[PDB]
Amino acid sequence: QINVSFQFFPPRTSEMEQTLWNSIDRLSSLKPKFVSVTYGANSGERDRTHSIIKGIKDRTGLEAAPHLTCIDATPDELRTIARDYWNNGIRHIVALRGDLPEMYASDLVTLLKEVADFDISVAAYPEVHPEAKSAQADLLNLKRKVDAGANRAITQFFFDVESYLRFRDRCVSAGIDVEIIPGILPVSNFKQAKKFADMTNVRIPAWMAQMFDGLDDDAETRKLVGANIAMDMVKILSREGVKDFHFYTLNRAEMSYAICHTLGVRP
Amino acid sequence: FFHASQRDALNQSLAEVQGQINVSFQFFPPRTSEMEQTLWNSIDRLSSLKPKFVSVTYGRTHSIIKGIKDRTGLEAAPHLTCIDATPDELRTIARDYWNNGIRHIVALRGDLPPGPEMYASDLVTLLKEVADFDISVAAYPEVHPEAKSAQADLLNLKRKVDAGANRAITQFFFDVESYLRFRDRCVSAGIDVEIIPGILPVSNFKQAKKFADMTNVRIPAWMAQMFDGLDDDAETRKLVGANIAMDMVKILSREGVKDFHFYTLNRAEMSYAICHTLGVRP
Amino acid sequence: FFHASQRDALNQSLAEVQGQINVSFQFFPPRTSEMEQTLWNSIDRLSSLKPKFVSVTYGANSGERDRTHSIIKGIKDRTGLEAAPHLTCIDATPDELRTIARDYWNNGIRHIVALRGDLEMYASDLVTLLKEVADFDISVAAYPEVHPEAKSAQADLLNLKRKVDAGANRAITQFFFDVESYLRFRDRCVSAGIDVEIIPGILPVSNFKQAKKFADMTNVRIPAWMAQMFDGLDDDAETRKLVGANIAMDMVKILSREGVKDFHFYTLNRAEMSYAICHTLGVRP
Amino acid sequence: FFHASQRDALNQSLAEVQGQINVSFQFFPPRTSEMEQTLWNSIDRLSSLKPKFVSVTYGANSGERDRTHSIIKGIKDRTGLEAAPHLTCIDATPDELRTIARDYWNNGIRHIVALRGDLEMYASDLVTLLKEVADFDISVAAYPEVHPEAKSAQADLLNLKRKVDAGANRAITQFFFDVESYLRFRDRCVSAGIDVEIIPGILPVSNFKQAKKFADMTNVRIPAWMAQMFDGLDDDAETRKLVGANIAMDMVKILSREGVKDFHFYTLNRAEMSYAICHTLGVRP
Ligand SMILES: Cc1cc2nc3c(=O)[nH]c(=O)nc-3n(C[C@H](O)[C@H](O)[C@H](O)COP(=O)(O)OP(=O)(O)OC[C@H]3O[C@@H](n4cnc5c(N)ncnc54)[C@H](O)[C@@H]3O)c2cc1C
Ligand SMILES: Cc1cc2nc3c(=O)[nH]c(=O)nc-3n(C[C@H](O)[C@H](O)[C@H](O)COP(=O)(O)OP(=O)(O)OC[C@H]3O[C@@H](n4cnc5c(N)ncnc54)[C@H](O)[C@@H]3O)c2cc1C
Ligand SMILES: Cc1cc2nc3c(=O)[nH]c(=O)nc-3n(C[C@H](O)[C@H](O)[C@H](O)COP(=O)(O)OP(=O)(O)OC[C@H]3O[C@@H](n4cnc5c(N)ncnc54)[C@H](O)[C@@H]3O)c2cc1C
Ligand SMILES: Cc1cc2nc3c(=O)[nH]c(=O)nc-3n(C[C@H](O)[C@H](O)[C@H](O)COP(=O)(O)OP(=O)(O)OC[C@H]3O[C@@H](n4cnc5c(N)ncnc54)[C@H](O)[C@@H]3O)c2cc1C
Ligand SMILES: CN1c2c(nc(N)[nH]c2=O)NC[C@@H]1CNc1ccc(C(=O)N[C@@H](CCC(=O)O)C(=O)O)cc1
Ligand SMILES: CN1c2c(nc(N)[nH]c2=O)NC[C@@H]1CNc1ccc(C(=O)N[C@@H](CCC(=O)O)C(=O)O)cc1
Ligand SMILES: CN1c2c(nc(N)[nH]c2=O)NC[C@@H]1CNc1ccc(C(=O)N[C@@H](CCC(=O)O)C(=O)O)cc1
Ligand SMILES: CN1c2c(nc(N)[nH]c2=O)NC[C@@H]1CNc1ccc(C(=O)N[C@@H](CCC(=O)O)C(=O)O)cc1
């Protein structure tokens, strides 16, 4: 069947905290294989990420994976943190280098596997990481992370489906045998999605830009339009063999819940 | 891999139709104060899309038409049936409209009261003489329940067109292939009017399904499965329904359909969004 | 490598159709000494490709019928090719049209492109009138994207059927750049029971600014990618030529693979582009 | 309508890459006054496209090193663009090469295309020698269809790896017409652990007779459809240009869709074709 995972971020306000827990209760009913919580060095720190992870586990029993980065952290610190997480039931970590230099994501994967037999997920970039020397180098890096122990790759979001398909083919050609899980970003706020995409070199098709044109002050239409795009995307990916999806919920459940419904993932 | 590129091509072609598609909206006389307000709010919202025309069902209609015309200046076409009316009484009601600014009328026989020898074709002819109205009639891609056969039903539409109907609006449908095959059959039968698809954006499946079973409109298995389990989830139903309708008009648009009629159920949200995807914007 | 493979397959198939494609060329009466010279140069160059026929337009409401007739005569005497004059009925009475038709027939002109003409009778009326005069080969216009004055796509399609039923044995389309529109229209013609081949009219574009204006007036869609391809080339005739040839070559390659074996070229009296496109279709001297 | 849809998708994607493609142009030392003039005209025309760099060949065993150096200097002073001289080691001793390298570096030449050269040391030896002289940007040749003298495809691939490991930061391919061969080679480079981008060398063909001879000598395959496309055009330069442009435009469109964002053009000192191909890639003045 189809497996799904949901990504959340640490709330910074009382309002967002309420929204998040509402979304977790709603989405947990879909029995995701796992959920994850992002890390922001200047937007919550490791303690806030960990707190949310602990809260999810206690409230839902679901496997919750914290996103752990290695910037401004020492190897000894990372080992101590990893040991603590393991001994506390956290056995899946999304290993990342982090949004800013001594170590790269592959170094963290190796460090984590030395501590314990963690389930590890790493970032993949269908349209190439902005800092990569080349597409070839970025693919060789993903192979490096997988070879170090990563169990699966989760991709940066994309809106050009062929870009993901072509990337998946290159991964297979390179001998990367783990699942390349598409990270899906349901878009309700285009202005913000466009900003993020431009910063990560993610192409926004001309038809998509036109689809959101003139909707700056029409939230309702943006939601229906964005849901249509996301549902169409997962439909095509599903037809192309994708059996795993990771949703960038941005702490909202409505869109991701509905998209999962169309994939047959229901309570 | 082709599925991906085909979708991009479909989406891009849709983005390029911007400002070339005509749309019409259908409303019904409100039965409560809440609906009254909802209706006028929707008319204001939808009026900004500059529809070719809007229509009002008839089971107060005359009032609604005038109100819409005297408020937006849109071509408000009232619906007229052959129920509870005599061939002579349908004439006084017919010239009153022309002597009031109403030149477009949707001619139908009408739903039979729960409890005549005059059909819609007979009604169309009974209007052309009074005056040269713009007559729009109903077409049934999946065949009208009472029709003895598909061909017989098709010939009837032709009869209604030859009588003076300058356009046909279809019963709602969810099987796009059925509409396309029907559109082809119409041309083969010599019907030279466009067969405007009537689109019903579904938010309440339970109710839509009941209406469908009553009008002989088929609900595809994939659609039934798509709405299964959402009886108590209005939010998901709306996103799913919008997706279905948007996918429909997108496919229809690529097939050359440049005219759409929306059964708004007096709500603007869904139809407004579907129009947005078709490039119909304020 | 889907795209790469699809390309090699498309290219090889095109290479294999050599000696199976029929082509026709459309010219217009020269208005200057320079254009007169250009036209005859193009006629000699293109005649070497042995087209099934060539045609010469006649601007409706122009009153320059004699020019069209003169050019047609010149082509026949100079090349021995079948030359078809375009004839419009919007600017002539039935009697005048019958006289014009009879003279054509007696002058050995047995193929006429019957049109209503750019602004009482419609093209179908002209077709009927011509068949009554003599057993002419008659070609008529088809519109994949619907004629701008049609009350509906259905009405326009039934009109084509009327012209064919009246005696037209060839249908030539308005130019287009949306290949899928032509393919869908071809299927719709079958649904309407039209049994004549729908010959695509190909317009090789070198001057985009002018083609865009023409397309806008005729309801012909210019894809966004095409508008982008010509953006910034207003003063670069060389690049426009290469880009336009690429577009036309791609178009006929796809149409060829779909089974089209007849092409009508709107040459604008120039031979270079049409000659090269024909070369890719295996139509060579 | 698979082929039609695939075309529209490919074309729209190409339109959307505008402002994301990097290009470079290769020239050769003019041998006559006419060619000298042609070259500078091409350099001015192409420089307006802001290429990442341009390069100038040096025929091994020619003894005309000065010409290459002179042209490079002229380009830098006239355009301010990065100009890379090609340097071969088959006709010079290590000491001579070190002197040549030092002078380039002191003259502001920081990018060299290091080659063994057309017939003791191999290109990898030159790469190592250059890096020892200074921190040069070094580009080397790659062969998707395997260099004719290689003992095996594996040996040739490992040789590219050796050159990259020695300090080369760019790989530029021999020209090709079999797009799938390049794509497969690109994947094989990843398998070999080569992390530099493999830049496709594009040869826009106008004179097929000459390109065929060159291809035959370099082991580059000419597809049967391509040979057929140029058949019968020996004395038709106009049609050859249109056909060749069509081929190159189709090639970069497919490569672009596959993620290639860097292209190196073998201009043969002419600007027209390369300029137009760049225009389709969104590289415009
Ligand atoms: C699914 C997902 C979740 C994420 N969650 C978060 C989050 O919670 N918090 C946060 O801060 N960020 C997060 N990010 C963003 C991420 O941290 C940034 O993309 C970051 O710049 C790189 O992280 P990485 O793990 O991909 O790094 P790496 O895999 O180390 O890659 C980073 C760059 O270094 C290059 N590289 C690798 N090894 C070498 C080498 N030896 N020499 C030279 N270059 C090399 C790569 O090719 C690449 O360009 C996420 C991204 C994804 C796709
Ligand atoms: C766009 C649209 C708007 C509508 N608006 C309204 C509205 O405002 N009010 C309302 O009351 N209803 C409305 N309806 C519903 C409609 O009135 C019903 O569907 C009704 O059952 C048939 O109407 P008709 O106009 O199709 O009649 P007809 O076209 O006469 O068709 C009815 C049946 O008679 C058959 N038939 C025709 N002539 C003969 C003959 N001589 N002998 C035997 N069989 C024959 C036909 O095949 C068919 O089965 C609407 C429907 C549509 C699609
Ligand atoms: C291959 C080709 C060659 C051409 N050559 C020339 C030329 O040399 N000179 C020139 O002047 N123009 C020329 N034209 C342009 C052409 O004359 C215009 O497109 C003109 O507007 C329509 O001519 P038609 O023959 O298609 O007319 P018709 O087939 O009569 O169609 C014109 C319109 O009338 C409608 N129609 C048909 N019958 C009726 C009816 N009974 N009642 C109401 N509407 C009806 C049709 O649907 C359509 O919208 C050419 C076009 C093509 C595609
Ligand atoms: C982008 C580009 C630019 C060029 N510019 C020029 C130019 O300006 N001037 C000019 O003269 N030529 C030029 N050439 C042609 C080139 O010099 C020839 O292809 C030449 O035959 C090989 O040069 P190379 O640098 O690839 O050599 P190398 O990489 O040394 O390879 C040549 C052969 O030696 C083999 N090989 C490598 N090491 C060993 C070893 N230790 N033992 C045995 N075999 C080995 C390789 O597999 C291969 O078959 C260019 C080619 C390209 C693709
Ligand atoms: C781990 N995230 C991430 C990444 N890639 C990089 N480089 N960095 C990241 O932090 N890829 C996946 C994910 C992307 N995160 C995000 C977060 C917010 C928005 C955004 O546009 N937020 C809007 C709308 C929120 C809403 O839905 O209401 C905002 O205004 O917050 C986009 C992507
Ligand atoms: C003219 N209408 C009509 C017809 N066909 C027949 N036979 N009769 C008709 O009146 N075809 C088109 C249109 C269909 N009308 C309708 C009206 C309501 C609903 C419906 O499902 N109503 C629900 C939900 C309303 C809502 O969205 O709030 C209801 O419970 O009222 C469906 C079709
Ligand atoms: C019979 N023609 C025609 C028609 N459709 C209509 N409505 N009317 C017509 O006359 N369809 C086919 C053909 C199109 N004719 C033309 C004629 C000129 C140009 C044009 O753009 N001419 C430019 C460039 C000429 C050149 O290439 O040198 C010009 O400025 O003349 C386009 C289409
Ligand atoms: C560095 N060149 C090169 C190589 N490979 C090898 N082995 N040797 C080389 O010198 N690969 C890339 C490039 C190819 N150079 C060339 C040079 C000329 C022609 C050629 O066919 N020239 C024709 C036409 C010139 C024109 O277009 O005007 C000629 O007759 O000069 C082809 C490839």
From Swiss-Prot, chain A:
Record-level GO BP terms? methionine biosynthetic process; tetrahydrofolate interconversion
UniProt-reported outcome of changing residue 99 to N: Strongly reduces enzyme activity. Strongly reduces affinity for 5-methyltetrahydrofolate
Q: Which reaction does it catalyse?
A: (6S)-5-methyl-5,6,7,8-tetrahydrofolate + NAD(+) = (6R)-5,10-methylene-5,6,7,8-tetrahydrofolate + NADH + H(+)
| Residues that bind NADH | 38, 156
Q: Which UniProt keywords apply?
A: Amino-acid biosynthesis, FAD, Flavoprotein, Methionine biosynthesis, NAD, Oxidoreductase
Q: What gene does this protein come from?
A: metF
What would you give as a GO molecular function for this chain, any one? protein-folding chaperone binding
Ligand binding (FAD):
39, 41, 67, 97-99, 105, 125, 129, 132, 138, 141, 144-145
Q: Which residues form a coiled coil?
A: none
The species this protein belongs to is: Escherichia coli (strain K12)
| Active site, UniProt feature | 7 (proton donor/acceptor)
Offer a single GO CC term for the protein.
cytosol
Protein's name according to its UniProt entry = 5,10-methylenetetrahydrofolate reductase
- What does the entry report about how pH modulates activity? Optimum pH is 6.3-6.4.
Names of the cofactor(s): FAD
This protein's pathway reads: One-carbon metabolism; tetrahydrofolate interconversion; Amino-acid biosynthesis; L-methionine biosynthesis via de novo pathway
What is the documented function of this protein?
Catalyzes the NADH-dependent reduction of 5,10-methylenetetrahydrofolate to 5-methyltetrahydrofolate. Is required to provide the methyl group necessary for methionine synthetase to convert homocysteine to methionine; the methyl group is given by 5-methyltetrahydrofolate. Can also use NADPH as the reductant, but much less effectively than NADH.
State where (6S)-5-methyl-5,6,7,8-tetrahydrofolate binds: 99, 156, 192, 252
Quaternary state and interactors: Homotetramer.
UniProtKB/Swiss-Prot annotation, chains C, D:
Q: Which reaction does it catalyse?
A: (6S)-5-methyl-5,6,7,8-tetrahydrofolate + NAD(+) = (6R)-5,10-methylene-5,6,7,8-tetrahydrofolate + NADH + H(+)
Q: What is its EC number?
A: 1.5.1.54
Q: What induces it?
A: Repressed by methionine.
Source organism? Escherichia coli (strain K12)
Instruction: Kindly give the InterPro entries that the UniProt entry links to this protein.
Output: FAD-linked_oxidoreductase-like, Mehydrof_redctse-like, MTHF_reductase_bac
GO:BP terms for this protein? methionine biosynthetic process; tetrahydrofolate interconversion
Cross-referenced Gene3D superfamilies: 3.20.20.220
- Please report the name of this protein according to its UniProt entry: 5,10-methylenetetrahydrofolate reductase
List the molecular function annotations (GO) for this entry.
FAD binding; methylenetetrahydrofolate reductase (NAD(P)H) activity; methylenetetrahydrofolate reductase (NADH) activity; protein-folding chaperone binding
Question: Which SUPFAM superfamilies did the record assign?
Answer: FAD-linked oxidoreductase
Record carries keyword Amino-acid biosynthesis: yes
Write out the pathway annotation from the protein's UniProt entry. Answer: One-carbon metabolism; tetrahydrofolate interconversion; Amino-acid biosynthesis; L-methionine biosynthesis via de novo pathway
Q: State the superkingdom.
A: Bacteria
Disulfide bonds listed in the record: none
Q: In what way does activity depend on pH?
A: Optimum pH is 6.3-6.4.
Tell me which cofactor or cofactors this protein depends on: FAD
Q: Give me the Gene Ontology terms describing cellular component.
A: cytosol; protein-containing complex
Quaternary context: Homotetramer.
